Amino acid sequence: VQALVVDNGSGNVKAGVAGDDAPRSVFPSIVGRPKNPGIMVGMEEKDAFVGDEAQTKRGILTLKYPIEHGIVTNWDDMEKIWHHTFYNELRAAPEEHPVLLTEAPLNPKGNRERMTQIMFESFNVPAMYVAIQAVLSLYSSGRTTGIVLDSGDGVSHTVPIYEGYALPHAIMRLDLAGRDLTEYLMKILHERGYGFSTSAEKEIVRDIKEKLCYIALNFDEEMKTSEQSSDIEKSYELPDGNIITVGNERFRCPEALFQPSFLGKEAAGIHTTTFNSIKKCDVDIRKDLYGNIVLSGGTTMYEGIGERLTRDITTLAPSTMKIKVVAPPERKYSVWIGGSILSSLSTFQQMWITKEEYDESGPSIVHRKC
Amino acid sequence: VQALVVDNGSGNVKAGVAGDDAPRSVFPSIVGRPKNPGIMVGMEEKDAFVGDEAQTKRGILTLKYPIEHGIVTNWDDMEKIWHHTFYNELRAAPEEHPVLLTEAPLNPKGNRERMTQIMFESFNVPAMYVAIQAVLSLYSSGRTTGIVLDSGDGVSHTVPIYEGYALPHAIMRLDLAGRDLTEYLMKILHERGYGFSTSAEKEIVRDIKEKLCYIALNFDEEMKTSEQSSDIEKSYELPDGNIITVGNERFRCPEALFQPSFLGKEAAGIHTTTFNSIKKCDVDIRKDLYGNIVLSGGTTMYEGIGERLTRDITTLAPSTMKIKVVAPPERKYSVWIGGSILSSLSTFQQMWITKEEYDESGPSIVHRKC
Amino acid sequence: VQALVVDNGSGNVKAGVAGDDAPRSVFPSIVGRPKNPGIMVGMEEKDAFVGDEAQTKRGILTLKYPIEHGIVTNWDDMEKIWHHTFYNELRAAPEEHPVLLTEAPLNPKGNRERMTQIMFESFNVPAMYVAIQAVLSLYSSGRTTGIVLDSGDGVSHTVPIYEGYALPHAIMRLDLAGRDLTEYLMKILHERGYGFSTSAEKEIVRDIKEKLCYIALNFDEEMKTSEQSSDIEKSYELPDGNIITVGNERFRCPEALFQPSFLGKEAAGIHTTTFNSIKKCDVDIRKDLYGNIVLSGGTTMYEGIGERLTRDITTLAPSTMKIKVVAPPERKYSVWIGGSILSSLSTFQQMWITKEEYDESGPSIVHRKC
Amino acid sequence: VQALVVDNGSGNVKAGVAGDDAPRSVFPSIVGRPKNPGIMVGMEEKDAFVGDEAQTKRGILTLKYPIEHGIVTNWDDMEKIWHHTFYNELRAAPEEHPVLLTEAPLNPKGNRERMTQIMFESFNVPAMYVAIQAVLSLYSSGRTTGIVLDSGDGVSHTVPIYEGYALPHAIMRLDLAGRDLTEYLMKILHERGYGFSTSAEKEIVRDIKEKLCYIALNFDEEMKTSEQSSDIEKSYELPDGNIITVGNERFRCPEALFQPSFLGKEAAGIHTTTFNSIKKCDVDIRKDLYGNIVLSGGTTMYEGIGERLTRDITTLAPSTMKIKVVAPPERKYSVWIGGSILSSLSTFQQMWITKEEYDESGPSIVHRKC
Amino acid sequence: VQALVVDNGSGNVKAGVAGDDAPRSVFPSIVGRPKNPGIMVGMEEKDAFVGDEAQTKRGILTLKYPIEHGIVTNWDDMEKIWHHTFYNELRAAPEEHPVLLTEAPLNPKGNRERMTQIMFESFNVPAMYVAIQAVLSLYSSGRTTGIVLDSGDGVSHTVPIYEGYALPHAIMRLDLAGRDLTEYLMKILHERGYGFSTSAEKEIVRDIKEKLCYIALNFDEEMKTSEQSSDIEKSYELPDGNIITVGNERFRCPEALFQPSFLGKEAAGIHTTTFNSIKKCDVDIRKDLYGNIVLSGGTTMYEGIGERLTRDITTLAPSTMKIKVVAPPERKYSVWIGGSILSSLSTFQQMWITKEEYDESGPSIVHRKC
Numbered sequence A, B, C, D, E: 001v002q003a004l005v006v007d008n009g010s011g012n013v014k015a016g017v018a019g020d021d022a023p024r025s026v027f028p029s030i031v032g033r034p035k036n037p038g039i040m041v042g043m044e045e046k047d048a049f050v051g052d053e054a055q056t057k058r059g060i061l062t063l064k065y066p067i068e069h070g071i072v073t074n075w076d077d078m079e080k081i082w083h084h085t086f087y088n089e090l091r092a093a094p095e096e097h098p099v100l101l102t103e104a105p106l107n108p109k110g111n112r113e114r115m116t117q118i119m120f121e122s123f124n125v126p127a128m129y130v131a132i133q134a135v136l137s138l139y140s141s142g143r144t145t146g147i148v149l150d151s152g153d154g155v156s157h158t159v160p161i162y163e164g165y166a167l168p169h170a171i172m173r174l175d176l177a178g179r180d181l182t183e184y185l186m187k188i189l190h191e192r193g194y195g196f197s198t199s200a201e202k203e204i205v206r207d208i209k210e211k212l213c214y215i216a217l218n219f220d221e222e223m224k225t226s227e228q229s230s231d232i233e234k235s236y237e238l239p240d241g242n243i244i245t246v247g248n249e250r251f252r253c254p255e256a257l258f259q260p261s262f263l264g265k266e267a268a269g270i271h272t273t274t275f276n277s278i279k280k281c282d283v284d285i286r287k288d289l290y291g292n293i294v295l296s297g298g299t300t301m302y303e304g305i306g307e308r309l310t311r312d313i314t315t316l317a318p319s320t321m322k323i324k325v326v327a328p329p330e331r332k333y334s335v336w337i338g339g340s341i342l343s344s345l346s347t348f349q350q351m352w353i354t355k356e357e358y359d360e361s362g363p364s365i366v367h368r369k370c
């Protein structure tokens, strides 16, 4: 009767037991291995730190994110992360509860198969189910129709849905996300004379990004508006104590989402992946889709994304239709909350993958029940 | 179960058995050889005096320190010194106890290899271990994080550490120490008309240094404040009975630490070796390092070093951070006490270099277990 | 019709007028200030020596490199250096010729802006242009496609190019260079009992590095091959006349390039910055890039770098492709020669920044024409 | 336009007006006071004889050298000596000319301050300047680089210089000089049955020293070579008319310079003060220093010092370097001649201490202009 | 097992066999030759009288002291004296016992060499050794540290020693002694109308000196205190029976020791030879030396020497130190007693010069074993 909800992002792990309004444990997904040798006798090594503990001391550690673009690169690392979750933070047993793992649309079969296989074989779990992040956000928004476009560090989905039915041919993933905007925010931040070559320093960047970055209404405008610089430059204060001052970098760093040309990729921006994901949907549901666009996931937390996205689509799609982007407060957790509502539904209880069914049917069954 | 702790300095040897709060035998490391021929029949020659005995009669002897800048120049002399330690003062056997020898960071391999080799082959010892002085002081300070900057007659280390892990690339040694401040205090003391050309006389100087020397808050200030001389000149009274009076020499002798330009070396002073040793450490631990700086070793006993060092770093490093130099009472022994705490730890017992392991693995193994 | 080519390195300044096959003046970039006071009456002070003159007498001087990691730390010093170039060595006037200054990729805007500003305002120059070092080396190699990875004392670039087009997102700079391998060669050389604390002595080291250092094929092999030491130890003879003998230090000093772990930085080595700089390039040009890798800059002069780099990439990248590192003879000047060929091209004459255009458009225009 | 050069030695005063190739007046610095009462009526008392006059009649007088180890013991005596110089021998006025006084390195401030003070206040002089003897010898040698090691009766300097710059930390003074070799030549001469208890007799000794003393190539050799005595014993003929014969005393008297052990002092000999004064100089200038060693001052006039010093250093310093000791003819005056060349230089005229500047700035200014 | 101790003074010969507390034979060293011809038939001529016998009849004899200032002037005479010792008074054989001869510091080699040579060749002795008088007195005083300043008729030594080690450079001999105070006491005694031109009469003087002479506390005082003469004039009664009365001569005769100016020599007095002999000793032992000064030898027997010497040194040396002159009772024999204690020591037996070693090694060996 208690469903255990773990949504594995890239660069966050949000885990809380079902029925709560906000997740218990929110900690970045990081596996630190101390680079230099330990000296002081009596210290507890704990060879590989994990999660928040390992982001409290980042000066000693070489951090490796195990998830890059929503696809596990290194399993040992992830497995260790989950272990940290269930034991050190959720404080729930593996064998007692069913758990809900979350996954990205169009994600290689390898992640499903090997993900569950690692859940049943190494951990022991009674039942399991892995749902597309996008759709889960839609439960949270509590409405039955709309595009759900989320962007987490790894991946950015656009999954349209019409009145409860999902469109498998419309789904569209772009790879511009939080970690490409940080790994970009360095290439730009060099311009000012600052420079960050190291992992720990990359996370310092990520903080800069979260605090000081906004998205311009019209970028061509603001690039001119910054010639005369008054309140645009905000002073960020490092863990060091040195005082940085970031210029244009504030609004040209997050803009990479709308123009990927900057990052160098040939993909289309967010506005043309939303709009395009619609244009693949039949001409009859476009009304509802244009109406219900729901932002989700962290990367869209930037101040003023709603306005820019709306105006931009409106420019793209015919003027007759009203475009409304619903940007709910506390959307950073939308995927998780959707995990709660979903896992708490009385009819949903039929769909869990069962310890038995896995045992007899092999790990490949995951593909059939998703 | 009794660990024997010998910390070999340059110009002191502090030896006491583990578990004591202060070392049993503290005597300068000196090998006197009487220069003139002995006459009185029945006198006991004991050709080469050692330690305190040889500093009670310094008029007959030509003293030779066997350690110059923490690196053994002449082995026979040192070997003789240790011999004096274990037999005439510690009163412990060599073969009964394990002994802990202490060494300077970035110290030529020769001193490790040949040091142990002389411990196992000529003396017979069951087990042995040689630890960096800096880190040992940090156990004594009982805190797990901070810069430990010591200066003994030979050498001055800055070894930062963060939460039990040591940073091998940060370590920084400067060669300004007690013996360069005495050998300088002569070049200055000549200015007053006094002059000391001889070894014995050099030690007289060292006494002058210990008693009458303080470190100015702001040197440029005091050089002016001494134009009108009231209480600055203190009268020191020699073994001779003649009465010296030392002028500015009091505060411009120990200042050489902060400005090496005076001694002539091109190295940076103490404040820029501390601050620089930090700047090589990652931007994430700087908080803790700036906070926990621990003075250690004799040469920092000068009255008022804390204030000057703090203000000086604070001037160097960004003003936002609080700098606190912990100058514990009885820091002259910090390295030794750290020898006690360390050697008394239950987990440490695994690390000793074993008579066997040396016998089979050759003397080179020292480098692997330090 | 005569273009004046000055490529500002860190620790060298290579200046020669266009059309020559090798640069006229090659002298280290050093600003000496004599530390002690001058005595002999009638001597010509010339307060701050510069370049080769100041490396003929390094015993009196405290040397300060004005360029650290390709980014001017202290302008007065550099300005003085150039002055020394144009007047005392190139023997060309500033106002007569256009000059070509060279710069490092991803280099803070400050160096461009202030560099030209100092060229037009203090010196007077008719026209000016500042090109990325990497690309300039590629003209010299006379081929239109390849990675150009150079390492000068300050910086090491990897700038890929495909058939005349440059990839701005692929560029990758690492900070391991000649001066980190010298400043490291001390930390290691201490191990043998030698030690160099002073600037002048650092340059002595740099000589040791240039003459006696080679790069191992497989390092793990040679670390074993040195247990039995025959021809590995080479005897270097100081300006003093004392005879040093360097051990392993020969091949473990330059290896820091391939493993930065030694220096302590968390960056990837040279092989993974080359290989990684490729992996950011589209899958279609990889053929040409893997084929045409061009070593450049001084730091790669080490005997046997070609073999190690090739085998190492080959291990990294799929075996099907042939990797060929072109290591042209006289690659130390590749950047300069590229300065000659480039500045001598008939179409290039359109791109110079003009005295006028600077006067009206402010110093910021540099960013637009590079 | 005529500079007056007085170099105050211990046991000589060499005074001549600038521009001459050799000094006008050379007379020993001695203040005789007739011990017994005068009888013959009409004799001119002139209570205290001075200089050569007082060494023509030494039987009546008790001689007191006012300079002992280059530091004025008794001022009245010296003041009287100078007076004798300017009036009775130089025949120049005090008030007409600027005068150049000479002083020993590391000499107590008292001698500078009180020396000038006695020059401006009691004598009246327009301008004055006091230069280190060592450096002045170096002008005379006309070369810009080398160790200048002089030994006058009082003091023996080693002052290295590199290409016009002086090294203040290298300077090294030893106290073995002409007067310790005479006061020693008595302790040895007693061995033969001769003995000299009185001042006048001490000067007789000094003559013996000057005429009959040479320095052995290898002392241990000659101590054996004197067992069979042929030409080693030379017969000296006193003012008395009695005929002395001096044995080994010839070469073991001046050897005290190379071994101070004989005199009893703990200082190092001349060879280790030269060689050591080098070893304190940076490793870059050692070439030039080893090359240019310049003997100077009287005490080095001994026949065959060049050979012994050279071979001895060569034994000390690495064999690769050529050691050359330049022992110019007429080196007894080197300090003076250097006084001439220096005082005659057109740029030097700026440095004189001025009657005015002294009047306003107090006598302490001497320390600032030296 | 019986050591024969002969201490040859100038004007005494103190000979007694080892182990006695006071010497057996004490007789003046005099060789009388009767001047006039003998007449009475049957008288025993014994051409040259010696010692006490020759001082019982001094009217017939012309006395010649063979020792003048501790250096044998005439050998035949001395040889005869010893002969008188061993046969007529010690009553010991030459060949049976080893003998200890005593000598003055800084004494011409001639006296050592020829002294032993006369002991082994003419007399036959099994073993021999010749020790410095000063040091021997120090055994007698039974303390291991102090200045030993003795004055016998010939010579006055100051030989400092520190804790068993002797300082060869400190030794200092002055020639003011008993025989210069007698030969002076005549020049003064003439003043009163008495006069002694002849040898025998000189010895009468010496008696006057011994009995009636004291040393003033402050001489300038007493020269005034004698204007009113009460108890100062003491009446001495000659062998003649005539009654002398000596005036000031009492205290101005022995004062010549403290002021040699009177005798005419240029040497310093006793107080400045003690104090100066200290000042040549290192600044570290001065404490002990100032403390332990030991008077010795006859000439210091004068009533009240202790007080004057102490106050006088105290005036010379810094007031902080306590000066104590130990003037042991029966110090006239101190040198001899020291001969007993020394010769009776069990370890001393190794040092004797052996009949053999002399036979093979020639007489020169004496110099090596002293």
Ligand SMILES: C/C1=C\[C@H](C)C[C@H](C)OC(=O)C[C@H](c2ccc(O)cc2)NC(=O)[C@@H](Cc2c(Br)[nH]c3ccccc23)N(C)C(=O)[C@H](C)NC(=O)[C@@H](C)C1
Pocket (backbone or CB within 6 Å): B190, B192, B193, B194, B195, B196, B201, B238, B240, B242, B243, B244, D069, D071, D072, D106, D107, D108, D109, D110, D111, D175, E283
């Ligand atoms: C406390 C001491 C001494 C005294 C009791 C202290 C008092 C205070 O000195 C004086 O006032 C005397 C005078 C002096 C002369 C002039 C003057 O304006 C001030 C002082 N100074 C001298 O004669 C120098 C001579 C000297 C020799 Br050689 N080479 C040297 C090298 C450099 C400097 C000087 C010298 N001098 C006394 C010595 O070195 C002796 C060997 N010093 C000592 O070992 C100890 C006992 C130190």
Ligand SMILES: Nc1ncnc2c1ncn2[C@@H]1O[C@H](COP(=O)(O)OP(=O)(O)O)[C@@H](O)[C@H]1O
Pocket (backbone or CB within 6 Å): A008, A009, A010, A011, A012, A013, A151, A152, A153, A154, A178, A179, A206, A209, A210, A211, A297, A298, A299, A300, A301, A302, A332
């Ligand atoms: N308050 C914020 N403002 C701006 N960006 C943010 C903020 N919080 C997080 N981010 C960005 O979003 C990322 C977190 O996304 P997340 O919700 O974890 O996606 P996922 O759950 O799919 O990993 C962070 O790494 C950061 O780049």
Ligand SMILES: Nc1ncnc2c1ncn2[C@@H]1O[C@H](COP(=O)(O)OP(=O)(O)O)[C@@H](O)[C@H]1O
Pocket (backbone or CB within 6 Å): B008, B009, B010, B011, B012, B013, B151, B152, B153, B154, B178, B179, B206, B209, B210, B211, B297, B298, B299, B300, B301, B302, B332
């Ligand atoms: N009380 C004091 N005041 C000032 N300086 C001191 C004092 N005690 C010792 N020193 C200086 O410190 C030195 C002792 O340093 P030490 O603790 O022995 O270092 P190490 O143990 O590394 O040799 C002495 O030689 C002296 O120069």
Ligand SMILES: Nc1ncnc2c1ncn2[C@@H]1O[C@H](COP(=O)(O)OP(=O)(O)O)[C@@H](O)[C@H]1O
Pocket (backbone or CB within 6 Å): C008, C009, C010, C011, C012, C013, C151, C152, C153, C154, C178, C179, C206, C209, C210, C211, C297, C298, C299, C300, C301, C302, C332
């Ligand atoms: N012959 C050589 N062998 C090995 N290393 C060399 C050699 N010559 C130069 N170097 C290294 O390369 C550096 C010179 O690089 P340089 O070509 O000046 O780069 P930049 O022009 O970017 O400064 C030197 O400082 C030295 O460290």
Ligand SMILES: Nc1ncnc2c1ncn2[C@@H]1O[C@H](COP(=O)(O)OP(=O)(O)O)[C@@H](O)[C@H]1O
Pocket (backbone or CB within 6 Å): D008, D009, D010, D011, D012, D013, D151, D152, D153, D154, D178, D179, D206, D209, D210, D211, D297, D298, D299, D300, D301, D302, D332
């Ligand atoms: N011809 C000579 N041979 C040997 N020694 C000499 C000779 N002439 C002088 N001396 C020694 O050198 C001393 C003179 O040194 P001097 O040049 O006066 O030095 P300073 O000028 O510093 O006093 C003399 O006292 C004597 O001891």
Ligand SMILES: Nc1ncnc2c1ncn2[C@@H]1O[C@H](COP(=O)(O)OP(=O)(O)O)[C@@H](O)[C@H]1O
Pocket (backbone or CB within 6 Å): E008, E009, E010, E011, E012, E013, E151, E152, E153, E154, E178, E179, E206, E209, E210, E211, E297, E298, E299, E300, E301, E302, E332
């Ligand atoms: N009682 C005395 N009072 C004063 N002076 C004395 C006394 N006895 C001896 N002397 C002096 O001391 C001398 C004896 O000295 P002595 O002890 O023989 O010295 P040494 O043994 O070296 O010859 C005598 O010649 C005399 O001048």
Ligand SMILES: [Mg+2]
Pocket (backbone or CB within 6 Å): A009, A133, A150, A151, A152, A297, A298, A335
């Ligand atoms: Mg997400």
Ligand SMILES: [Mg+2]
Pocket (backbone or CB within 6 Å): B009, B133, B150, B151, B152, B297, B298, B335
């Ligand atoms: Mg220490």
Ligand SMILES: [Mg+2]
Pocket (backbone or CB within 6 Å): C009, C133, C150, C151, C152, C297, C298, C335
């Ligand atoms: Mg370059």
Ligand SMILES: [Mg+2]
Pocket (backbone or CB within 6 Å): D009, D133, D150, D151, D152, D297, D298, D335
């Ligand atoms: Mg001289």
Ligand SMILES: [Mg+2]
Pocket (backbone or CB within 6 Å): E009, E133, E150, E151, E152, E297, E298, E335
């Ligand atoms: Mg005697």
